[PDB]
């Protein structure tokens, strides 16, 4: 439908097709249209573009159903809890210590992240797909080895201020940084990783 990054209140941006990861919606002018990646390459939910087909495992060739996201738990290592679908906004994931659970939104509604759930449609929705990606690599600064110690960080978990789709361990004055499971993204406020990227990268000024 060329009126589906209006009907969701989108910003121009790319977002996921939900049946075939070797597309992805473009929308463009207020207009979406429906577009090939290059070949060789698939939608990456996580970047937003299209990217190599080695660096996205949850779309495989060669099957009926190029999005995979039936073992996400297990294979991205995602919590327990709900998660929003890469790929589709009218459905979602369930993880229980490693097992999935694909479910489906009723009929005319939606899953929102905030809520863990799907609601009837509003006026500005599927907001999951509405983020700013990091950079694709993270470049972190030569010494950023010194973060914990010159900023005397207590032990334990703190933001990654080059990346919110990572956290900062802070052990004996030495630093680490650490990859959310992919497809999450680093909760400031409670310092734990979870499925909202809107909140966590930056989506609310996107609108």
Known sequence: AVNLCTQYGWPNGNYPDPYDCRKYISCNGAVATVMSCALGTVFNP???NCDAY???PICQYALPSPIVVT???NQYGWGNGNFYHPYNCAEYIGCANGLTTVNACGAGQYYDQALGRCALAGTGYCRQYVFTPPPAPVVYPDGFDTYCSANNLATGIHPDPYSCF???ECTFGRTTHMPCPAGLSFDRSLLVCDGNRYQNCGGNVLV
Do not use: A
Request: aromatic share 8%.
């Open 166 to 168: 990572s956290y900062v």
């Open 46 to 48: 996580n970047t937003r």
């Open 54 to 56: 080695g660096n996205v």
């Open 71 to 73: 073992n996400i738990c």
